[PDB]
Design a protein around this ligand. Structure first.
Ligand SMILES: CCCCCCCCCCCCCCCCCC(=O)OC[C@H](COP(=O)([O-])OCC(O)COP(=O)([O-])OC[C@@H](COC(=O)CCCCCCCCCCCCCCCCC)OC(=O)CCCCCCCCCCCCCCCCC)OC(=O)CCCCCCCCCCCCCCCCC
Ligand SMILES: CCCCCCCCCCCCCCCCCC(=O)OC[C@H](COP(=O)([O-])OCC[N+](C)(C)C)OC(=O)CCCCCCCCCCCCCCCCC
Ligand SMILES: CCCCCCCCCCCCCCCCCC(=O)OC[C@H](COP(=O)(O)OCCN)OC(=O)CCCCCCCCCCCCCCCCC
Ligand SMILES: CCCCCCCCCCC[C@H](O)CC(=O)SCCNC(=O)CCNC(=O)[C@H](O)C(C)(C)COP(=O)(O)O
Ligand SMILES: COC1=C(OC)C(=O)C(CC=C(C)C)=C(C)C1=O
Ligand code: SF4
Ligand code: SF4
Ligand code: SF4
Ligand code: FES
Ligand SMILES: [Zn+2]
Lengths: 178, 83, 263, 385, 198, 114, 95, 118, 112
């Protein structure tokens, strides 16, 4: 099904009345005045902006935001170094090397997410079997120096501890969907 | 210092990085935090650790607590269970 | 002379009398999904994951153990021989403990892949699983044997390639556990090969427990210098430090095996 | 001819464009656009990445129509795997595909005006655009660059409040098009700036491979959404807005109509979205559900292999074209049996359009060229790839 | 499993024969994928002739060039596989004509047949190095002005050999041999087990 | 053997084209050093041209030579029709990079893999 | 909203439209957050019976391209049936 | 008409490779062996030629591996030994081909394991 | 009769039946030189003869547009002379000849 836009169905022959109406349109800028009315109208509408520090634009539970590594309620970090979070990262951001901890458990000696390399796809959130690496809600982590953006296990684990309460609520809300 | 005894030697220069800055480490260390949790005294030879929370936990696995001497430990949580 | 002609899906390959059905598929180029069959280990038939369908025959045959016969057509990809694999893989997986992110034979599993390629997408085992007590077989091999698919390749190697004759099956039913009855370590050279030969990650290497994961390992083919047999070996290096040395096959020198010292 | 380059920093240059202009006086006699300022190596990087981990790249080729772009890769990979997405997923892709064409057109119409000098239309619609991204963020977690449309099916089910919120946006959006409609469609100043500028004749448009609103604006009747119905575009009713003459006005008017026609398609999708699964049930192609991978061994093996290695699509090659808001976006994916692709030629509606700038901007002033680029809706991510 | 209509695999198949018959001097192979897509294969010399017949034949009008690309099979003697995908708005069908070109054996240019190719042919030269005779203005389009090497060739390193940084001493941007701080981890992904006869 | 000729039937005819390009570059070096305000000496630059034109002196095959000038011509066009700014041109001189010694003892003293 | 009637009337007029009916700012009409928990439906293939994958795996039942005219009276045939002319819309043919 | 050239296609001059990495890089054409871990043989089919390995020094700030060799991660796959050798000759890289070594036929029969005297 | 064709550049051609009959008869003529059993000659002659026959048979252009498709009649005119141009071009090309050269072996083997 098609539709002609800007196709004049027929040649309306000028009638004085028509001509006057048109000539008035050119002479007294009638349509231009129409446009001014629209903007005056909004001037009276409530502005949609938010006080950025005081009010925040709404983000729902799946917002990917900033990486964090979670821990079991007991206190044992969730990651067991299966290293498929490294395998599926599209940007090669996550670097993981592991060795059996003294307890005998499997754990990662080094877990480094290069956030400048990361493109926040959220697949790592997807891939983890124990769901140790999660996309945390915080988006405000702008840093003065490039090195700060590179994150080792201690920053991510600390990021995990700080935001665990909200991360748990967010995962709680969206897990049925996944 | 860190979880893995990562401590720059007294002569290493990456210590310059920490000059005038905090070397980020976490007081809460897992090796210790799991220890605190007590051994679960289950009464069945084989029990399962779903990870706590089912889908919100870790892949389900069954542990054989048959060895009387030792206690089964979930390769995931580290939680220990004894018969 | 001594050249029967058997058809693998009508390809008229010709094989010496004595060749098994699995071997007939190999020369055409097809590969029967197999567990418990290793070229240099005796045929045992334990897994029955290789069931194929010779044409005009009531039942499917065991590839690795069936002497081929004249005329037979293998029908390896026949609807039937796929139910005969879609239904075996159902069983191996049913009693299997899903700790694939613990099993360091993660990408080195002939049971996930043979499951991702020749098996089903789901499970129907709503019942409970089993668990087998682990064993301290030694300081080199970590036997997390709840993983074992009772494929008896260890018991063979430990008897046929190496003359240890220690590892054995113990019991019957679904609690046949293939571990030393009394806890006597498997101390012998040629010991570490069990790791490489167990397709499951039940018993794997204890030093290389959790240092890596195979997709990452860059593999450079080199020569054994520890001993004068000069066994061929592959040095698996990640980010510039060697993580593992595992055998690579040289018919004449080390045919898929390497010493406990040089790995 | 006083060679002058439209350097990148200039706002009208879309950030990266070095149009070497030869100014025969103010009249410009020749343009030699020097693209390449945003070539990222998108198609040599994809060869080194598995099919799922290359999806994200397709959200960054045209960065103003993310999901429609990732519906072209998803359809391609799906063809090469002879798998089809479940019924609910196909409606969701059509629902998100039209939200993206409204999103691209708000981008194209308002930024064109920003270049010409009308500043208010951009602000009114951009507030309506963040209303829309929210829909992306609420369904995928990313305002833009979602990764929601997956090679097989889509990734996660719609949250339980999205379709009501999409109705409320679509219910009131048309007045918003009506409002810039009044402010920038009859202004003698717009018409003069846009009418009779960059006229492209019908056969020339086909020969230059324009294939888009540029094809439809001159009267050729071609929409890959009705001609070769991909996904469900066979079960939704819409009218292609064919223009008559080809001036940059007729092309604007067509873009404003497609926003209106997309509201008609979005309405149908909310009214008729089926109950069902959002991703095909073959664990071999689409990853197993979180509960299943944590309770069934066959699912953990399938999750481990899919995330670590890949789908391993069967060897073959396909060119799949979908009507992206800019025009025909096509992926020629050549595939060996491996889990990672061998070649992925992204046909960008835009490589062809920018070539036409020299022919279209003929006998035109420095100012006309600003309108000529604006009416091609060119995003240099797609052209540079 | 995708729905497949054999109406197309028959229509397209027939057309393939029609093209082949009409242009037997150049058509080497004409196949229809299982995905209902035709792919006439032509000797490189048939570039001009086969396209023109498709652009201007009443029973096969293929007016617009969807794309011109060149896969590179290093094993193949003729490395590049120039592929031209065309669309027929009249018959609502697409066809692909693919030829083979080695590094120093140029292909003819079709800018005459379709001017769409003016840019894509420059793109193929810049990335793969195939040369197109009779091209109006062949010159690098996507790569940097001084770039050395053709990037999409399978034999070109991803990271490349040169990277840019600003040097104060010389107060100007300056190439240096690439030094990467985390090399691309080359995960080996192929599984040692095949999937089907194919 | 049995190759098709790209543009030059034989090394002889091909060499003709190289001569032309050399001339072109030779005549152009001075202009560039002035339109780009490059801090180099025309003589110096002209030697560089010679360097490059000989770096590929060994090529014996006619087809390879022909492409080489096509490519060479393209570079000139980017430098006379100026689309290549100083950063691009000076790169030819490898001014910032530290030269590497080729003496074995030198390499031994510095790099694991020479 | 929350606009004194007069401002609204001026607004509606200057714009020429009842902008009040369709305000852009959202007020208590947007889906409340914490919508109820979702129990999503399991699709086909989850049957526990007659679910053999071999009977549902289009991935590799696909075959190598069919080949015609390999190098190694008759009526004319088109790429496909000539296309059918699109028909003018009926809700809004023009404009 | 075609012209005659006996010169081994060498196109080292057109490829655009830095001089150092064309004269100091040895590539090996080999058919990949099978990690003994798995028994599948689908990765021991096509020949591959791989450039010689180079420096991988540790990075001071994060400890990540760092490499200065561009042709390191590049492994091209060639279907036959003849074609791979050709690639090395025209690109000018040195080559040292390794013959494919395929498992020799081995005679197996379940009956043997039950032999009266083995 | 019509005011204008949908396509922007194309212009209404009065005497369209006459213009088509001129072009169609010309092509038939040029094809007369093609080798006798040449595939292009037999195939295009069949298409062109049917097109003329219909153009001769139908005196109403609107129904003529329906009978040989072509959308607007003006397009059919462009397609016919485009074909006339190619017919002249192919006579020079001589594509009816056998394959120029067989593909190098393994040139078309995709799994690689
Ligand atoms: C000047 C004369 C007063 C203008 C005036 O009162 O305008 C608002 C008043 C109501 O307008 P509105 O758009 O309905 O206001 C939004 C809410 O209804 C009413 O808004 P609200 O719900 O936020 O009401 C609270 C508001 C109430 O504030 C007011 O309405 C009075 C504002 C006086 C500004 C002077 O007070 C505030 O929020 C703090 C700001 C107070 C004024 C700040 C600027 C003062 C400038 C002083 C120097 C000039 O305007 C009219 O009554 C009609 C004016 C027609 C003009 C033609
Ligand atoms: C209180 C604030 C009032 C603002 C009024 C303008 C904005 C609202 C416009 C609403 C609207 O859309 O209607 C426009 C309307 C819309 O009409 P239209 O363009 O849709 O078509 C109607 C006209 N025909 C049918 C003939 C084509 O425009 C007009 O009615 C004509 C306006 C003529 C204006 C002539 C120039 C301005 C006047 C110059 C002389 C000086 C006047 C006084 C100046 C100040 C002195 C102190
Ligand atoms: C006896 C006399 C009988 C009646 C005579 C009427 C005389 C009108 C006086 C102005 C005439 C302007 C005019 O004729 O139009 C010129 C132009 C529109 O003409 P155009 O459409 O380009 O026609 C093309 C033909 N070459 O006009 C324009 O381009 C206008 C562009 C305006 C851009 C800003 C418009 C602002 C409009 C609102 C403010 C108007 C002024 C109000 C305040 C005045 C002072 C209080
Ligand atoms: C100051 C700016 C520096 C820029 C310099 C310049 O632009 C770059 C450049 O030389 S562009 C490449 C030139 N390269 C050729 O043009 C091919 C030469 N071809 C041969 O050399 C053959 O081997 C031959 C048989 C002719 C040997 O014969 P002879 O030794 O030349 O005589
Ligand atoms: C909508 O098209 C585009 C613009 O013009 C309106 C641009 O300005 C720009 C960049 C503009 C600036 C300075 C933010 C981009 C990227 C673009 O895509
Ligand atoms: S996936 Fe989850 S668990 Fe496995 S390594 Fe990455 S983070 Fe640790
Ligand atoms: S063996 Fe280890 S890896 Fe293979 S399946 Fe069982 S657990 Fe997963
Ligand atoms: S241990 Fe490995 S080899 Fe021995 S039986 Fe269990 S699985 Fe087979
Ligand atoms: S391989 Fe056939 S029985 Fe195990
Ligand atoms: Zn646990």
């Amino acid at each position: 099904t098609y539709k002609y836009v800007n196709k004049k169905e027929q040649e309306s022959e000028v009638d004085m009345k028509s001509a006057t109406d048109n000539a008035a349109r050119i002479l007294m800028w009638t349509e231009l005045i129409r446009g001014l009315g629209m903007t005056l109208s909004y001037l009276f509408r409530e502005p949609a902006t938010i006080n950025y520090p005081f009010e925040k634009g709404p983000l729902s539970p799946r917002f990917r935001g900033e990486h964090a590594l979670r821990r079991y309620p007991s206190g044992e970090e969730r990651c067991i170094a299966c290293k498929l979070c490294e395998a599926i990262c599209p940007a090669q951001a996550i670097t993981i090397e592991a060795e059996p901890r003294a307890d005998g458990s499997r754990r990662t000696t080094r877990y480094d997410i290069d956030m400048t390399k990361c493109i926040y796809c959220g697949f790592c959130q997807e891939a983890c079997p124990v769901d140790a690496i999660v996309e945390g809600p915080n988006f405000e982590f702008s840093t003065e120096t490039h090195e700060e953006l590179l994150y080792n296990k201690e920053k991510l684990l600390n990021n995990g501890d700080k935001w665990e309460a909200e991360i748990a609520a967010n995962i709680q809300a969206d897990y049925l969907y996944r | 210092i860190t979880h893995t005894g990562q401590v720059y030697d007294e002569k290493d220069y990456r210590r310059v990085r920490f000059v005038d800055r905090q070397k980020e480490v976490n007081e809460n260390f897992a090796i210790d935090l799991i220890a605190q949790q007590p051994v679960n005294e289950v009464e069945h030879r084989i029990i399962a650790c779903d990870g706590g929370g089912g889908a919100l936990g870790h892949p389900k696995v069954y542990i054989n607590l048959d060895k009387e001497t030792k206690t089964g430990t979930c390769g995931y949580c580290g939680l220990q269970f004894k018969q | 002379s001594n050249l029967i002609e058997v058809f693998v899906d009508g390809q008229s390959v010709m094989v010496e009398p004595g060749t098994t059905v699995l071997q007939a598929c190999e020369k055409v180029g097809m590969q029967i999904p197999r567990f418990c069959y290793h070229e240099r280990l005796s045929v045992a038939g334990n897994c029955r994951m290789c069931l194929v369908e010779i044409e005009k025959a009531p039942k499917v045959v065991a590839a690795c153990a069936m002497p081929v016969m004249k005329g037979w057509n293998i029908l390896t990809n026949s609807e039937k021989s796929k139910k005969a694999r879609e239904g075996v893989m159902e069983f191996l997986l049913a009693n299997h403990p899903l700790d694939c992110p613990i099993c360091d034979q993660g990408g080195e599993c002939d049971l996930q892949d043979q499951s991702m390629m020749f098996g089903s997408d789901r499970s129907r085992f709503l019942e409970g699983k089993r668990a087998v007590e682990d064993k301290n077989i030694g300081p080199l091999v970590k036997t997390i044997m709840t993983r074992c698919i009772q494929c008896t390749r260890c018991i063979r190697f430990a008897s046929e390639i190496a003359g240890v004759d220690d590892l054995g099956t113990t019991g019957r039913g679904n609690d046949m556990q293939v571990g030393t009855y009394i806890e006597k370590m498997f101390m012998s050279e040629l010991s570490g090969n069990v790791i490489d030969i167990c397709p499951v990650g039940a018993l794997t290497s204890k030093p290389y427990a959790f240092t890596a994961r195979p997709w990452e390992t860059r593999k450079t083919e080199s020569i054994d210098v520890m001993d004068a047999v000069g066994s061929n070996i592959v040095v698996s290096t990640r980010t510039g430090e060697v993580m593992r040395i595992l055998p690579r096959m040289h018919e004449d020198i080390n045919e898929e095996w390497i010493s406990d010292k040089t790995r | 001819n006083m060679t002058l380059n439209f350097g990148p920093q200039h706002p009208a240059a879309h950030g990266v464009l070095r149009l070497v202009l030869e100014l025969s006086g103010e009249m410009v006699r020749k343009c030699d656009p020097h693209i390449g300022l945003l070539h990222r190596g998108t198609e040599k990087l994809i060869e080194y990445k598995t099919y799922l981990q290359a999806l994200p790249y397709f959200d960054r080729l045209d960065y103003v129509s993310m999901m429609c772009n990732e519906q072209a890769y998803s359809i391609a990979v799906e063809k090469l795997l002879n798998i089809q997405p479940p019924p609910r997923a196909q409606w969701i892709r059509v629902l998100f595909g039209e939200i993206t064409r409204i999103l691209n057109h708000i981008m194209a119409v308002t930024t064109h005006a920003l270049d010409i000098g009308a500043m208010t239309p951009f602000f009114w619609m951009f507030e309506e655009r963040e209303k829309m991204f929210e829909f992306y963020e609420r369904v995928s977690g990313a305002r833009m660059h979602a990764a929601y449309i997956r090679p097989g099916g889509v990734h996660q089910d719609l949250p339980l409040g999205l379709l009501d919120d999409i109705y409320e946006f679509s219910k009131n959006f048309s007045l918003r098009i009506d409002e810039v409609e009044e402010m920038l469609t009859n202004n003698r100043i717009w018409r003069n700036r846009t009418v009779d500028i960059g006229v492209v004749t019908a056969e020339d448009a086909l020969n230059y491979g324009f294939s888009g609103v540029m094809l439809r604006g001159s009267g050729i009747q071609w929409d890959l959404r009705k001609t070769q119905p991909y996904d469900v575009y066979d079960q939704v009713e819409f009218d292609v807005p064919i223009g008559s003459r080809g001036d940059c006005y007729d092309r604007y008017l067509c873009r404003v109509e497609e926003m209106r026609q997309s509201l008609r398609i979005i309405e149908q999708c909310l009214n008729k979205m089926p109950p069902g699964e959002i991703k095909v049930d073959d664990a071999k192609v689409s990853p197993p559900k979180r509960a299943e991978m944590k309770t069934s061994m066959e699912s953990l093996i399938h999750h481990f292999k899919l995330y670590t290695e890949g789908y391993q699509v069967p060897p073959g090659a396909t060119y799949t074209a979908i009507e992206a808001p800019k025009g025909e976006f096509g992926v020629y994916l050549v595939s060996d049996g491996s889990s990672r692709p061998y070649r992925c030629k992204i046909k960008a509606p835009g490589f062809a359009h920018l070539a036409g700038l020299d022919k279209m901007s003929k006998g035109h002033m420095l100012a006309d060229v600003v309108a000529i680029i604006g009416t091609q809706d060119i995003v240099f991510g797609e052209i540079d790839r | 499993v995708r729905p497949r209509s054999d109406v197309t695999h028959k229509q397209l198949s027939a057309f393939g024969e029609y093209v082949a018959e009409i242009l037997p001097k150049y058509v080497q192979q004409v196949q229809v994928s299982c995905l209902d897509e035709l792919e006439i294969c032509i000797h490189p010399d048939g570039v001009i002739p086969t396209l023109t017949f498709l652009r201007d034949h009443t029973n096969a009008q293929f007016k617009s060039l969807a794309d011109l690309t060149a896969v590179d099979v290093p094993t193949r003697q003729n490395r590049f596989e120039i592929v031209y995908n065309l669309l027929s708005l009249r018959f609502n069908s697409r066809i692909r004509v693919k030829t083979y070109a080695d590094e120093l054996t140029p292909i003819d240019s079709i800018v005459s047949v379709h001017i769409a190719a003016n840019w894509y042919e420059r793109e193929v030269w810049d990335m793969f190095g195939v040369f197109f005779f009779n091209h109006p203005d062949l010159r690098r389009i996507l790569t940097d002005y001084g770039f050395e090497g053709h990037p999409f060739r399978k034999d070109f390193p991803l990271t490349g050999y040169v990277e840019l940084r600003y040097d104060d001493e010389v107060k100007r941007v300056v190439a240096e041999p690439v030094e990467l701080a985390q090399e691309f981890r080359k995960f080996d992904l192929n599984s040692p087990w095949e999937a089907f006869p194919a | 053997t049995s190759v098709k000729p790209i543009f030059s039937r034989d090394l002889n005819e091909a060499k003709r084209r190289v001569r032309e390009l050399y001339r072109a570059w030779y005549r152009e070096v001075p202009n560039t050093v002035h339109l780009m305000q490059l801090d180099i000496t025309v003589k110096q630059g002209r030697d560089k041209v010679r360097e490059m034109f000989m770096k590929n002196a060994h090529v014996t095959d006619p087809r390879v030579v022909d492409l080489l000038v096509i490519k060479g011509k393209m570079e000139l066009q980017e430098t006379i029709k100026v689309w290549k700014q100083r950063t691009h041109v000076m790169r030819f001189f490898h001014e910032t990079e530290t030269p590497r010694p080729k003496d074995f003892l030198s390499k031994f003293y510095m790099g694991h893999d020479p | 909203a929350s606009a004194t009637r007069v401002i609204q009337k001026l607004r509606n007029w200057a714009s020429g439209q009842d902008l009040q009916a369709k305000l852009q700012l959202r007020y208590q009409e947007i889906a409340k957050r914490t919508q109820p928990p979702p129990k999503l439906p399991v699709g086909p293939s989850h049957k526990l019976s007659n679910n053999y994958y071999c009977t549902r795996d289009g991935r590799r039942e696909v075959v190598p391209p069919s080949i015609i005219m390999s190098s190694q009276e008759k009526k004319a045939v088109t790429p496909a049936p000539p296309m059918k002319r699109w028909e003018l819309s009926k809700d809004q043919p023009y404009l | 008409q075609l012209i005659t050239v006996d010169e081994k296609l060498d196109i080292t001059t057109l490829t655009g490779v830095p001089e150092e990495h064309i004269k100091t890089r040895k590539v090996r054409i080999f058919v990949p062996a099978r990690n003994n871990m798995q028994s599948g043989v689908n990765n021991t089919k096509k020949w591959k030629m791989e450039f010689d390995t180079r420096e991988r020094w540790e990075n001071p700030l994060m400890g990540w591996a760092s490499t200065a060799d561009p042709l390191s991660n590049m492994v091209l796959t060639f279907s036959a030994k003849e074609d791979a050798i050709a690639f090395a000759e025209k690109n000018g890289w040195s080559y040292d081909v390794e013959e494919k070594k395929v498992p020799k036929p081995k005679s197996k029969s379940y009956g043997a394991n039950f032999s009266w005297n083995k | 009769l019509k005011k204008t064709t949908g396509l922007v550049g194309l212009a209404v051609c009065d005497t369209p039946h006459e213009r088509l009959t001129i072009l169609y008869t010309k092509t038939l003529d040029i094809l007369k030189h093609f080798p006798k059993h040449a595939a292009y000659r037999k195939y295009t002659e069949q298409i062109t003869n049917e097109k003329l026959d219909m153009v001769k048979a139908e005196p109403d252009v609107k129904k003529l547009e329906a009978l040989l498709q072509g959308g607007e009649v003006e397009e059919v005119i462009l397609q016919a002379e485009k074909e006339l141009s190619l017919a002249r071009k192919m006579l020079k090309w001589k594509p009816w000849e056998p394959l120029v050269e067989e593909p190098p072996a393994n040139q078309w083997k995709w799994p690689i």
